[PDB]
Amino acid sequence: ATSASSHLNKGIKQVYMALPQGDKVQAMYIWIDGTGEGLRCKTRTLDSEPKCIEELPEWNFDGSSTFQSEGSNSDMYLVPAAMFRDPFRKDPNKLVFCEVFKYNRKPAETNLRHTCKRIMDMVSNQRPWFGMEQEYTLMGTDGHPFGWPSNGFPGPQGPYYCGVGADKAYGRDIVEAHYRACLYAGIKIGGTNAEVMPAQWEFQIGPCEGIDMGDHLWVARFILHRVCEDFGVIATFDPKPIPGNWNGAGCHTNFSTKAMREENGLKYIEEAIEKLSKRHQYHIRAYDPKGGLDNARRLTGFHETSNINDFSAGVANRGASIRIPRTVGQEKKGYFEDRRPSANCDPFAVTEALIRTCLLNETGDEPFQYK
C-alpha cells in the first residue's frame, strides 16, 4: 500500500515544476540526525548559482527536533561539505550535504565525517579507493515489503536475484529513477541489480577516493529516500527486514590502495587482511550505528553471510568475512571486499576503520587520538 502523498496528482506538481524559476536558486541542505542513520533536509533560496562548495553559507537548525540536543543550547550548525546537482529540482538548484556542529562549534555526536576527513588526509599519498554495494528493501507504508502478498509471502527465493518480469522484480521504477537521479546529481553510481529477496535491490557506489566515499553514499541514500517518497514507498536499510529464510541487506565495502592496485599488489592485500584478522571485534562495533546489534540478525553464517563472532578470509569465499576476488588472485593485484558491514552502516565509520587498521596499523579497542 502506497502513501496518501503518492496519490496526489503528479501531473499537477509537474505543471508547477515546468514554470521557469528565474534568477533565484534553491539549495537543499542535507545532514545526518542524532540516530546516526536518519537524514534530514530543508531548503533555502540563494541569489545565484554557487560555483563551488565554498560559496554556500553555513546554516543552522534546532537540534532538539533531530534527537541531537536538549535544553537551552539546542541550536546546531550546518557546514556544507559536498555539493551535487539537484535531480528533483534540476539545474541550477543544488543538494548540499553538510556536517553538523554543536552550539560551541564542536562536532556533533553523529558527525563522523570530521574525524574521517582528518584520517583520510593522513594517508592521502597512498590514495585509498572505496566501493560500497548498498542493499536496500522497498517497503509499503504498512511495514511489509513492496509487492509482497497482503500479510503473506511470495514464492521461495531463487528466481528474484537479477530477475526480470512482473513476478520477479518488485518496484524497478524506483530503481531506474534513483539510478538516473544519481547519475544527474554527479553521484559515482556503478550499477544496480535485483537482490535474492524480492523487493530487495542494490546499487554500487564507487570507486571513490578517501572522504568522497561517505559523501557519495550518504547523498545516494538521501536521493533514494526522496525518490521513494515520490512513489509513496519506503526504502529501508535494515540489515534483516524479514525474519526467516529471507536474505539480509549488507553494504559490502571494496578497499584498495595505490600499492594494492600496482603490479604484485596482492602481497599488500594479504598484509591488510591479516591486520584485519586481529581486529574483528573493533570493526564489528564500527560497522553498525548501534554497536553491532542490528548486524547480529544478518551475520548468521547461513544466507551467503559470515558469522558475527568469527573472522574468516579467502579467495572467492562468499561466506568469508573478507573476500579476495578470483580475478584479483589471478592478476596478483586489485582490491579486497569487506562483506561484514550492515546495510545501515555509516560509511564514514566503515572507511575510517579500514584506514586505521590496514594503513595506520592501529591496535587495541579504542581509536588512536591525533593519529
**What CA–CA distance (Å, rounded) separates 158 from 179?**
25
Closest contact distance (angstroms) between CB of 6 and a second copy is: 7
Q: Which residues contact 194 (CB under 8 A, 6 or more apart)?
A: 160, 161, 162, 163, 168, 169, 172, 175, 200, 201
Name the segment binding Cl ion (CB under 5 A); options: 87-95, 188-196, 217-225, 306-314. 188-196
Taking the complex as a whole, the smallest distance from the CB of residue 126 to a second copy amounts, in Å, to 24
Q: Which region among 4-12, 192-200, 327-335, 360-368 touches Cl ion (by CB under 5 A)?
A: 192-200
Decide: is 219 part of the binding site for a second copy (CB under 8 A): no
Closest to a second copy by CB, 136 vs 268, is 136
Asked if 245 interacts with Cl ion (CB under 5 A), we say: no
Nearest residue (CB) to Mn ion, 102 versus 252: 252
Q: With contact defined as beta carbons under 8 Å apart, do 313 and 106 qualify?
A: no
Measured over the CA atoms of residue 64, residue 68, residue 71 and residue 75, the dihedral's sign is negative
Minimum Å distance from CB 191 to Cl ion?
7
One-letter amino acid identity for 364? G
Lay out the site mask for Mn ion across 184-213 (x = CB under 5 A, - = otherwise). Answer: ------------------x-----------
Grid cell in block for residue 255? 578497499
The CA angle 59-81-52, to the nearest 5 degrees, is 90
Which of these segments, 31-39, 180-188, 250-258, 259-267, binds Mn ion (CB under 5 A)? 250-258
Q: What angle (nearest 5°) sits at the alpha carbon of residue 252, between those of residues 250 and 258?
A: 165
- Between 42 and 318, whose beta carbon lies closer to Cl ion? 42
Please work out the total of residues on this chain that contact a second copy, with binding judged by CB under 8 A: 114
Site mask for Cl ion (CB under 5 A), range 36-55, x = bound = ------xx------------
Q: Which is nearer to a second copy, 224 or 354 (CB)?
A: 224
| DSSP-assigned beta bridge partners for residue 40 | 31
Contact between 148 and a second copy (CB under 8 A)?
Answer: yes
DSSP per position, 253-301: EEEE-HHHHSTTTHHHHHHHHHHHHTTHHHHHHHTSTTTTSHHHHH-BS
Binding site for Cl ion (CB under 5 A): 42-43, 192
Binding site for Mn ion (CB under 5 A): 202, 252
